[model samples]
Target: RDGPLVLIGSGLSSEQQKMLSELAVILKAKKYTEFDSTVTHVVVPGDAVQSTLKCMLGILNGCWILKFEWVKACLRRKVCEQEEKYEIPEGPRRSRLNREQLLPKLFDGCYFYLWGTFKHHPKDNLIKLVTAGGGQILSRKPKSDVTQTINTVAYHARSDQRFCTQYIIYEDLCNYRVRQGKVWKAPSSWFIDCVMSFELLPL
Candidate 1:
């Protein structure tokens, strides 16, 4: 339980810097640190997310290490200023915080538009979706540009191996249906077990 150790880059536009400042306020982040394995780095650019994701994966796996993405996702999902504010925390010998609450979800809320069909091809997996289709992420693209405008993609973004949109589930790909207000993540079991079962005796 360590307080969020942020190592924000010093080379962002003033607007991005301001957004980050606001973000730090919300996370109740400490002054700052310099890439210490003992802390969370925020506002870091995309080029470093690969390394950042590795360190953050130790404590928080399957989530984006970048704090700005968290901020944007949370703000889009709800509101930061409206949510109850909290005090700065001290840790290593620490306790619970909302950051931990939000940590598990980095790629869980993206909006995806499936490219084509996958029913006949036969090898479907969440890991495949993430690894092959490129889904899971821990922050890269700017969810917003400036003016504090939130960037909610109707679907995933451009094709750059270094970047991604967390959304992968689709109506055609997984035989999924869009719900009124929720997103679904599938496990390998969904495909593996079912496929095995089908080979045994499919309904």
Candidate 2:
């Protein structure tokens, strides 16, 4: 059985909750009363007045946002349905301010050094997306340095390796440069393309 952790969001009528809770039990999906990192799906009213803290957390966690009808759909099929088509659609009701709320996301564990000028896109836009996706930006180019260690055992560490993945994004390839480390030197387009597909692209 497919088990997806679900969190019920605000603005649901009692009648709607009736079906939602019942369907979740029948489908074998676990439902949580509060938001947590383990939640995989968040269901809210289709006409959501505004996003809740739980809803925002779900977004940051990259959980599928669904409407009440998704439960009905799943009930009809006698199994939890795939979330792609059942996802809640973003609209005027869910204001830009609400969507701006962010935390750790798709780019978690990655660090980026943005260099030079962007041609077709604004620099701020890239920075916003990268940070929203949980990637940190470095003000300066990366440099490799040895970490001083205790005499107990000659331990050494590279400053660049502090980040799980390091990306040096440049505007123009010819003028691009690199430091001494296991880093990726790619164009600004890489991030944009990754956003387009909603997944990190290969360097």
Model 2 — which ten-residue stretch has the worst lDDT? 147-156
In terms of lDDT, the best-performing candidate is 2
* C-alpha RMSD for every candidate: 18.4, 11.6
The per-residue C-alpha lDDT of model 1 at residue 72 equals: 54
Task: Write model 2 residue lDDT over 29-82, tens digit each, in one string.
Answer: 666777676777777777342345456546545666777777778878878677
TM-score of each: 0.25, 0.44
**Model 2 compared with the native: what TM-score?**
0.44
Name the top TM-score candidate.
2
Clash pairs detected, candidate 1:
64-138
lDDT (Cα, tens digit) per residue for candidate 1, span 61-154: 2212343454455445544332112211121101123235443222232433233345433234333333322234323322334212323331
Tell me the lDDT of model 2 at 83.
67
**lDDT at position 106, candidate 2:** 53
lDDT of 2 at 84: 61
